[PDB]
Design a protein around this ligand. Structure first.
Ligand code: NI
Length: 248
């Protein structure tokens, strides 16, 4: 019952029923003119001050949440790419918040990097607050995908021609490398944005995942999480499970 675990549990419980959007930031493998662009081909560290600061936050979140009771053998390249994606995902969120003149402190958000059995690396984002309503979900997804595709092309470490960069930009947009949770539907039929409950989804689902400690990553595992209150960021896996247990 550390203050950190209690603090995280209370913070989430107060937001148990706050409706939020659910997004997934991802990428897909691309081959352009024989050039392979994989999930970890975005390793430029761009020298923009905010991005640098966000990347440092991801690094230290990893460092503080690392359990040294057990060894960790995640590839260095994998960690680096995840830290970079953490900074880029957040840059996208903050850019759209700016478009809407939304004060960051009026927003609840949660970010979790994972490795899916089929898709590999992806990043879940829950985000909402008083300035958010369900009808705005589609606009948010479209705007986030604009900034996501723009930053990915800037961060790509593969030498690309201008034609290739433009092609990559359009692929990341057209194939929706930012997805929005909707209710299940038919292809022809309308899709409706499906808001989720912030505290509940975090405590009962995202905090139940197993920590990735190897390369290749365990299917379904998580790398790294963070939130707008810096509450879950530094928690070790065992601490995360204690939060779920106390939340109930
Ligand atoms: Ni996932």
């Amino acid at each position: 019952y550390s203050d950190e675990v209690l603090g995280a549990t209370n913070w989430l419980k107060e937001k148990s029923n706050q409706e939020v959007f659910s997004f997934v930031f991802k990428n897909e493998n691309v081959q352009l003119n024989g050039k392979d662009i994989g999930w970890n081909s975005y390793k430029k560290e761009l020298q923009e001050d905010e991005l640098k600061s966000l990347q440092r936050g991801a690094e230290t979140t990893w460092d503080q949440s690392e359990d040294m009771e057990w060894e960790t053998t995640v590839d260095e390249m994998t960690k680096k790419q995840v830290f970079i994606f953490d900074s880029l995902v957040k840059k996208c969120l903050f850019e759209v918040l700016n478009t809407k003149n939304i004060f960051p402190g009026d927003v609840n958000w949660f970010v979790q990097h994972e490795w899916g059995k089929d898709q590999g690396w992806h990043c879940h984002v829950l985000i909402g607050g008083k300035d958010f309503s369900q009808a705005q979900g589609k606009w948010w997804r479209r705007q986030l995908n604009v900034y996501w595709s723009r930053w990915l092309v800037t961060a790509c470490n593969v030498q690309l021609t201008p034609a290739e960069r433009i092609k990559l930009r359009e692929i990341a947009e057209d194939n929706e490398w930012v997805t929005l949770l909707t209710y299940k539907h038919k292809q022809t039929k309308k899709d409706y944005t499906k808001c989720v409950l912030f505290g509940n989804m975090i405590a009962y689902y995202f905090l139940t995942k197993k920590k990735i400690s190897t390369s290749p990553p365990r299917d379904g595992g998580y790398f790294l999480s963070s939130d707008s209150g810096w509450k879950t960021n530094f928690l070790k896996e065992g601490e995360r499970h204690l939060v779920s247990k106390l939340y109930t």
